[PDB]
Amino acid sequence: LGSMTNKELQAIRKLLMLDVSEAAEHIGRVSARSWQYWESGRSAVPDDVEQEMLDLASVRIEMMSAIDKRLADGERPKLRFYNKLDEYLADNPDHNVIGWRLSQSVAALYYTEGHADLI
């Protein structure tokens, strides 16, 4: 911790399919312009933001591990790709827009690489 660069921050943010405005609001609790400064290198990536991003990446890893278990158990998963945030929130009433993006990132990865169907 204390080593995350502006490029690493943007890389994780985009891999999790977050828009800047979504990361700024729910992770940084800063203006979108402030988040852009962290990604541009104009201001250092804060320690607390770094750890929050790593924690969110870890959530995605746990989601992928759960699908890997289903794959090893012989299931070809049918993964919900929520193109609609309202539909995701109805099915996942304890999550928010950030959970929606993580869901999309995992479903899109397994579909595009040939391991899962999308529903």
Add this chain to the structure above:
Amino acid sequence: LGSMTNKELQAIRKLLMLDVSEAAEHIGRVSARSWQYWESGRSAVPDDVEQEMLDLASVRIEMMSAIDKRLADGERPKLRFYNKLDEYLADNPDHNVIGWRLSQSVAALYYTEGHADLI
């Protein structure tokens, strides 16, 4: 060809880190509104668009295999993460914005999987 769904189209587009405006201009050769129509589910996805998306997914796989070859050769790759399109284009003068986004998707993946560092 002819069976790609709106969810599959959006999933591949987002995994490749393409904005709708970018995909619409360069892949669809249509307006953003037309591309949003294809992602809305009221329409079949055109065969030519499906083929191009599948081809770009294959380009992404070949980029990953090229890094895998470097890893197998004993290199610890320092992948340039381009947070600025212009810098990518200067380094890759035969590519466009679509190639930029593919480069971001591959670099972000290998960084988070722990296989390469970002510069």
